[model samples]
Target chain A: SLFELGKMILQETGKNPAKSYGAYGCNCGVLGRGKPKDATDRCCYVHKCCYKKLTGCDPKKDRYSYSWKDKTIVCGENNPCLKELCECDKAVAICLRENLGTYNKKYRYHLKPFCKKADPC
Target chain B: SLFELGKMILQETGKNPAKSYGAYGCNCGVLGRGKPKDATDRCCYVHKCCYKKLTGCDPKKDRYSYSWKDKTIVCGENNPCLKELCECDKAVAICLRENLGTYNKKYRYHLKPFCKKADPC
Candidate 1:
């Protein structure tokens, strides 16, 4: 299963899955209008496209549903949409975990917004 | 010795030292005048105070100098101020590493600035 595979990858790599689907890169929905901010954001952009193409899931409805803890999609058993959605999220998780090092490097000082605001001090 | 101790603690706990003094919490120097944003920032706040009181090291001058790779102070041998400055940075490194878990919790979504700006999706 994609979910189990995502979990296994996260564990083996010692990386936390993105807490939310849009937790990296660009926004997850219509608001994520611009080019992806980086490679990780590109992953989300590709995942969003996949959901729209395969599952017909509401782009907005599914945004927050894909976090690490809430990734499982529940519906009638064997619902094809459920399987697709789960696969979509797990694939994104794998993408995200794989790009974790790049993400960290790019955002090394992101927590310190002030650094971006002022001259070194 | 303080630097060695800081390295030991970081190794034992698997915490990376802040890449720069202002990497967490509030800013550093005169620009960092506001209340510290959190406990880790408070560590920097106190460290800046120590530099000010004990060594008169320019607050701005020291900000970029305290990163993990650049932490060593290289003044004339046996200079008291050099010792004080090194000790101050090491203590704060220890403080920052100790609070890394809290820092991560507080800034879990920090890298995803887009998440803060828009509604889910």
Candidate 2:
């Protein structure tokens, strides 16, 4: 028997967060957008924040050199083709918010500053 | 050192699942659409499933009895008056999918059955 913080206890109740990360998951720490600094996929990969689904672009040699010339930017994942996209930090926040519900106690701190800080012990 | 199924191990790499569940959380249990049978706001409580937020409507007496005739659905949480909505299971899956990242291992099985089953334990 444990005295779980009713709040914390509730979040952990339904689904398992760990299991979700394995599927549809990525390190979410990839570099940035645009034609990979150049036109190569190897130049860098986008972080998981790149997608509303937390899906980031993969790092591939061809992709690194793949010209962004008049290409239709698919509005998903790390594709720079989207009309409206979140910035890196915003994307990371969504990533964290999406996953952090298990942590953010949104159920309680409604009308207050709710964003998380750098780290927690 | 323990072998994390390389697979299951890979999934657990990022965010810690247990910690996250403490916040922004709910049981995801509750019940379905429409008014709460009666209208005292106590007919029934909505499950965490009711919201894309994994957020749900709290069961209260005043709310249950309040007339749902002309009120804004708010398009969030488990409101009685929303245009479209996912069934109980779909919402639960979204809840699960969002947090399951710690389990999915999407890195591999890129194009295969990667969802966690009813019970993966």
Candidate 3:
């Protein structure tokens, strides 16, 4: 479940999700999509990666996309896997908001990574 | 007084003394001597700089060096100025030890800056 996965990431890294997945991160091969990719997509990919690490869930599939507008999970519900999407949504908001500084980006769906890892950057 | 000066610094910057005056700092023109610089000297320079900022006390003159051995004032006592050197020592110790780690450095007087400010680095 993304909710569990997301919380796990928060606990494991002791770092904000944005910090772990931003440009300093691998970017999950996500780049060059204008404005540094969509914020929700970036966040969703972050959770997906964490799920992959824990349960071998397909990084590319079996995932939930973050919704910038509703501040909820999109395209992910109790289908193949059951998840408390709201929990993951709130978790991301709690961690991401601190780094991004705004819950609402005024439809500026695109965003750059916030904090980056030291080494590769 | 070094004590008052140290407390003033803790209040002003909201940063640790070591953070503001480490190698990342101005270095107070003290850089070389077989090691990066002595820890006490480094901490002393940090306080001196703060004192200079407040009272224009000559940085080169009216100084108290840090004591790794006694963890107290090393050559600074009431002469032209009265300062609770112990308080300043503790302040420096509190801040510097967090940055430097371990009050006793095993005579490894030399140390590198623990953290650096962004810019020219």
Candidate 4:
């Protein structure tokens, strides 16, 4: 299935699956996680959420859990009832692997900011 | 739309957007097309259907178009009448990027020898 899926991209989009597509997609955050996009997009919502949903303590409120390290996508949050398991993570990967690269070339990838542990500290 | 779609994946699956592929879903050929799977399963129905649906012809059927080189999926073959664009190609890539890697290990009820070039060749 993956191979077949990969084949189509090579045919129609002329892109390779091994490459990141480059799109913040949901506008997740500085790395582009959720909502109104800034200038780019990608599809890996689950990955983005997993990889960069929420991080850094707000300190304003006792909301220390607002950080990425504290957030683990619990099932049924926005999960559609159609399929048994939520398809979010895969959706994110699709965008990242298929569309992100092109989008990133032009805009900012929200998660790009917190890519390393050093910066977070 | 694409952005929201990607975020979904980030929330659902735990995998990232950047990952190599590995799987020959369908029983179609050595690369695993068609049906009657050898081991695992995937769901990029459209993409897989498009990517590796049919390559290399039978050769004997006077069907000179039996080769992958000659085979360019003419729309409406197995395309469902539901979604407007048919969604086959996207289906294939979904499977390829999501489900394939974990399935390519062990058991050769069918020895896999596929992908590298287009269909017919």
Best by DockQ: 1
Off by over 4 Å in 3: A1-121, B1-22, B25-49, B52-56, B63-71, B74-76, B80-90, B101-121
RMSD list, candidates in order: 15.6, 18.6, 19.4, 20.3
- Candidate 4 structure quality by residue, lDDT tens digits, A1-121: 2333233223334554323232233332223244433322424334344433323312111111111122222223332221112233334434444553455433333343233222220
Residues B44-90, model 3: lDDT tens digits:
44543344333434332334443334543343444333243434444
Candidate order by DockQ, highest to lowest? 1, 2, 4, 3
Ranking by TM-score: 1, 4, 3, 2
DockQ of 2: 0.03
Interface C-alpha RMSD per candidate, 1 decimal: 14.8, 19.1, 20.8, 20.2
For candidate 1 chain B, which ten residues in a row score worst on lDDT? B112-121
Best by TM-score: 1
Q: What interface-residue Cα RMSD does candidate 2 give after superposition?
A: 19.1
lDDT of 4 at A62: 16
Q: Tell me the spans in candidate 1 whose CA falls farther than 4 Å from its real position.
A: A1-121, B1-21, B27-30, B54-77, B105-121
Scanning candidate 4 chain A in windows of ten residues, the lowest lDDT window is: A59-68
For model 4, what is the error of residue B91's alpha carbon versus the real structure, in angstroms, after optimal superposition?
4.2
How high is the lDDT of residue A32 in model 4? Answer: 28
* Candidate 1 per-residue lDDT over residues A1-121, each given as its tens digit: 3234334335434553333232333422222223456666566666766666555544323332233435432222345665566566666656766666567444432222122221111
The deviation in Å at residue A108 for candidate 4 is: 13
Give DockQ per model, in order.
0.04, 0.03, 0.01, 0.01
Record all residue pairs in model 3 with backbone atoms less than 3 Å apart, i.e. clashing.
none
Candidate 4 lDDT by residue in tens digits, B6-54:
2222333333321212222333222324433432333422333443333
